[model samples]
Target: NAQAEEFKKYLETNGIKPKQFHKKELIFNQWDPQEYCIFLYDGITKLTSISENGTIMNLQYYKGAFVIMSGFIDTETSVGYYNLEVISEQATAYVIKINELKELLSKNLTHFFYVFQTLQKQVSYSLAKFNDFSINGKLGSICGQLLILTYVYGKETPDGIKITLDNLTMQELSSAVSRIISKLKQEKVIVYKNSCFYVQNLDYLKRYAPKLDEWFYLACPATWGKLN
Candidate 1:
C-alpha cells in the first residue's frame, strides 16, 4: 500500500492527476492504444484476456494497489494488455502517459525501480498460476483461484467465508466449469447469492485442491506464519 501511495504522490508532485471510475466499467480494453500507465489508487478490478473463440477468460483479480502496465512491455503487435474491469462500487487510479513516465524514469531510478518491481511481481504471479493450471486442469485451477480469492477478499461471517469479489458472471463460470459451481452448491460446499459466493465448507472446497494451500504459502512467504 505504501508503494502505491508513494507512486500516487510521485505522480501528483509531477503534475499528473488521478481519475475515478465506477463499478462494471471496462477501465482498460485489450487492443486499445495504451500510451499510459494505470496505477490502481483504490478499488478492485479483474484482468481478463479474450480467446479466438470469442470467450473471455478471467486471468486474475486485483484490488487496492498495483501496476497495470502490460501494454508497455508486451510485443508491439500483440494485444495491448489485459482488459481491466472495475468490480468495486468505485475506483480511483493514476494515469501517466508513457512520454511523461519516460522522462521521469530517465531523470531518476526511483520510478524505474518501482516499475521494475511491479513487472517482476507480474511475471512471477503469471508463472506460478500457469504452472498450477498446467498440472491442475480447469477444475483444480478454479479451486486454487477460489482459495486465493477467498484469502484476498473473504470476510469472516457467522455462516462462513463470504467472498466479497463481485461481478462473477455465468458465462465465465460456464466457460470454466459451470457444473463445478452447481455441484459445489448442490453439495452444500458454497452458496451463491446476490453475485457473491458464501463458502460454507472450506474443507470440502479444499478437497478439490489440497495442494494449493501449501503452494499459496510457499509463493507468498510474507503471509506465512501470519494469521487472518
Candidate 2:
C-alpha cells in the first residue's frame, strides 16, 4: 500500500501522467522499441499470445498490478514479448522509462526493493493461476476468470451479482474457457447490456460449471472450497 502511495507521489512529483483506454484496447505490441514499466493503476488487463493453431492463449491477468517492461537489456527478452489488452470496460495505466526508473532508484535506494518485489510477485501470480487451472482443467479456467472479473467488478443485488464484459467476440470468449461457454448461453444465466454481462444466477452457472476457491466471495473466506 505504501509502495502504491509512494509511486503516486513519484508520478506527481515528476509530473508524469497516466493514459486511459477503452475496453479491448491495445497497450503495446511485441518488439516495440520504446521501453516502459507499465503501471496498471486500475481495471483488469489480460496478457496473451497466439498459439500455433492461431488460438489465443490467455496468459495472465493484472488487476491493480505493475509490469516492468524491458527493464534492462536482459529483461527485454521477456518484457516486450507478450501483448497486453484491457479486459474491463476501461483500463488505466502509466509508464515510466526503465532507464529513468533505475536513476530514480539510485537516488532513493529504499524504493528500489519495491520494484523488484512487485516484479517477482507478478511472475508468481501468473504461475499460481496456471497451476490452479491445471488442477481443475477447462471448467476451472473459465470459472476462475469469471470469479476474478466478478470479484473486481461485480455489482451486488438482491439476486445474483451483475458483472460486465467488454466488446468480446465469441472467439475471445471461447478461447478463455473453450467450448463450455455454450453452456452459459444455453442456460440463460447471463444477461447482456450495452457492453456488460450480468449474471442473474451465479449458482446456475456454478452447478454446471466447476469450483473456484471461496476467497473471492461475500467479503472474505479463509476457506478455499466452494459450492461445487
Candidate 3:
C-alpha cells in the first residue's frame, strides 16, 4: 500500500476538487493569509521572493507532484512569505482548505502521513540546494539547477539535451542563479529558442558542479552516464 497513492485516491473519493493553474499564475502570493493545503498532482511550480529592490529571487522549483505548505508551517499566523506560481503550461492541483484537511486527517491519518512525506522531500531538497550554493558558488549553483532541469525535463537530441517546457523563459531561468543565463549562452553551454533551452555542452555544465552529476546518476544511472 503506497501511502501517496492511497492519499491520491482518498482525495478523489472525498471530493477534494482539482484546480487548474495556467503558466505564471500565482497559487499563493507574498504576505497573503494561508488557508489551504495545495497538493500539486502534476506540473511545475516555483517559489520565489522579491527583494526591496523589487527583484525576484528564485528560491526553488518543484517539478512534479509536491506539496506547497511552507506558508502553513513557517509563520505563527500562517501567511505566505514567498510567491508561489505555476511555471508549466498548465497544472492540476487539489486545493484543500485547512479546516477540510484537518477534518480528513481526523478521519484517516494516512492523508497526514502522505503530506508529511512530501513536506520532508521539500525540506531535503532545500538543504541540498543550500549545500550546492555553498560549495559551487553562483555560477555552479546555476549550472546545478540546469543540470537537474535537464535530468527532469530534458529530451536528448543530436546537439544535446533539450528542456521541452513551452512557457519557460530566460527571466525564469536566470532568476535562480541571478544573472548567469547570458554567460552560459555566451559561452555556448546552452541555447534558447521558441521558449525552450537546448543544452549544447553537457560537460560544460557538469564541470561547473560535479556534485550534480553524482546526484543525477543516482536519479537515473543509465541516462546520466550516456548523456556525457
Ranking by lDDT: 3, 1, 2
In angstroms, the error of model 2 at 63 is 3.2
Q: Which stretches of candidate 2 lie over 4 Å from their true place?
A: 1-5, 21-25, 50-57, 68-80, 87-90, 106-114, 164-178, 185-228
Task: Compose the digit string of candidate 1's lDDT tens values, residues 32-149.
Answer: 6755667887887788888888887777777667777545543423234578888777899876665566777777678678878876766766665666667666666677767666
Q: Give a tens-digit lDDT track for model 2, residues 1-228.
A: 457668767776878788887778867655577666777777667777875587767776776646545436335334535677787677778777766766766777556666776766655545545665676666656666665555555676544565534445223534454457656655666556545576666665344323343334322232123222
Judged by TM-score, which candidate is best?
3
lDDT of each: 0.68, 0.60, 0.72
RMSD (Å) of each candidate, 1 decimal: 3.8, 5.1, 3.8
Q: What tens-digit string does per-residue lDDT give for candidate 3 at 183-219?
A: 8888889876555678988787787766665766754
Q: Model 2 compared with the native: what TM-score?
A: 0.67
Best by lDDT: 3
Please say which candidate is ahead in TM-score: 1 or 3.
3
Per-residue error for 209 in candidate 1, Å, reads: 4.6
Residue pairs in collision within model 1:
none
Ranking by TM-score: 3, 1, 2
Q: Give the deviation of candidate 2 from the true structure as CA RMSD.
A: 5.1
CA lDDT, candidate 2, residue 226: 29
The residue ranges of model 1 lying beyond 4 angstroms of the native Cα positions read: 49-57, 73-82, 106-111, 165-176, 192-197, 203-228
Candidate 2 vs 3: which has more lDDT: 3
